[PDB]
Amino acid sequence: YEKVRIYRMDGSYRSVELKHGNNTTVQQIMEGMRLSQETQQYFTIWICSENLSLQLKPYHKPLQHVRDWPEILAELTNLDPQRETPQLFLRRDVRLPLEVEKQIEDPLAILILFDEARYNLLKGFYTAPDAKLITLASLLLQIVYGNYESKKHKQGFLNEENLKSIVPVTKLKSKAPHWTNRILHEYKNLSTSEGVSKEMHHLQRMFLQNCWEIPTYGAAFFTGQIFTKASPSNHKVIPVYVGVNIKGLHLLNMETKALLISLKYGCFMWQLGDTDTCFQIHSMENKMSFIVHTKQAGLVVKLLMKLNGQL
Amino acid sequence: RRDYF
Amino acid sequence: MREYKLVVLGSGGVGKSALTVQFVQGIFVEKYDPTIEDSYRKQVEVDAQQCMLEILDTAGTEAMRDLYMKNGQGFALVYSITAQSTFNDLQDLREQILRVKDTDDVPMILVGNKCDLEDERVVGKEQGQNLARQWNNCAFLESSAKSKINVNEIFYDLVRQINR
Ligand SMILES: Nc1nc2c(ncn2[C@@H]2O[C@H](COP(=O)(O)OP(=O)(O)NP(=O)(O)O)[C@@H](O)[C@H]2O)c(=O)[nH]1
Ligand SMILES: [Mg+2]
What we know:
The complex is a heterotrimer.
Chain A: E1 2-7, E2 13-18, H1 26-31, H2 37-40, E3 43-48, E4 53-55, H3 62-67, H4 69-76, E5 87-92, H5 98-101, H6 107-123, H7 130-145, H8 150-153, H9 160-164, H10 180-192, H11 200-212, E6 220-227, E7 237-245, E8 248-253, E9 259-264, E10 269-272, E11 278-283, E12 288-293, H12 297-310
Parallel strand pairs in A: 1-5
Antiparallel strand pairs in A: 1-2, 3-4, 3-5, 6-7, 7-8, 8-9, 10-11, 11-12
Chain B: no helix or strand
Chain C: E1 2-9, H1 16-25, E2 37-46, E3 49-58, H2 65-71, E4 74-80, H3 84-88, H4 90-101, E5 108-113, H5 125-134, E6 139-142, H6 151-163
Parallel strand pairs in C: 1-3, 1-4, 4-5, 5-6
Antiparallel strand pairs in C: 2-3
The complex binds phosphoaminophosphonic acid-guanylate ester and magnesium ion.
Domain FERM (chain A): 2-311
Protein name (chain A): Krev interaction trapped protein 1
Region (Interaction with RAP1B) (chain A): 12-34
């Protein structure tokens, strides 16, 4: 048998036998994973390198997309292939309704979703006010470090290295150092409060509860660029991440991850450009508009249609 | 071939 | 944070996966499900410091054993107290590890799993202690993935061995 590693975002993997070599499909790979129907429903196989992540179709043959990654990169992006090695991942299905996710109780499905949500938080893809980031930090301390204890946790504990595993990298330098006391206090409170279940899946679910209300939760992210309407040129190039999820469309400044706009389905409309290299958003209810340039335009528009359509 | 999501 | 590469070895059916999954995820896998090659990651606290564990959960039979041993820093050698054959298989693994590492001085622990299954016991504790004695006084525990007895200690103890 040939085998392939299917990774998760924590860096773990499960090797799966390919019964039809490179003609094995995603559905067959999923069947060969260790998973009940219960755990499986929420997740599918994605192909991802450092700067390009794509959710596969169940009839796709993933080893062929790995094989063709260079053509795919050049069709969808301007990245240097030499810097992008793809792997296959088990990840949240981008079409998973938030209403369906909210009633999950399976502990394995909960930890897989938790790991993915943690990964996005630490990379900076979740925008939230400091109080919410502090609450998520305190939950990670309970999950990862167990019960609070003054001798260990009060002083010299929340240094750089440690803060790095609990706050977004975008807040580590500037903002994070000052949160240390409120994080600790909240952590203390989680431990000291016996009303709060300390079963692992319960705490992980609590972290997820606090992510579900973040507007980019569950987003597939794409890269693009907008041009400012201020002027000089006509005008300045702003690289952006475009987040698409079951809630709507979200633009992030590529460099700082700052949230530029968030638009809910029903409050905007889109049109694909003639060459498939851009799309336009019209925020009716605000009567503003903007154009994102990206070779992933077609993909972004088809996803907006699907996720708007299911809502 | 090229239809994702 | 120090990374620690740990390897779980032993024959078919002993609970390599069940122990690993209990330690890492806190879940008990109740179902026959043979492994090809799984790798898990877990941050833990050992002897009051933070350790990042990478744990390789291996197939019960072989061709990449030699590479696992080459790469691994610490080894959990697991048999089932319920099955003598699984116990007998361990001698060779031990010797194989010593060959690849070209030394006797290798973090290792002998684990007799399924100790919740007292009435199915075919391997006595004595035979287990005895074998560990013989292996240059190797660390030794009985564990249950199902009841959680001695599950963390298997992995913490390899970390302290590696830290020697
Ligand atoms: N009662 C009991 N059953 C156990 C224990 N550990 C594992 N089992 C059961 O024994 C069977 C084998 O467990 P598993 O962990 O898959 O064994 P393994 O060593 O990984 N097998 P493989 O080498 O094929 O990958 C499973 O049904 C499992 O639930 C235990 O401590 N107690
Ligand atoms: Mg196994």
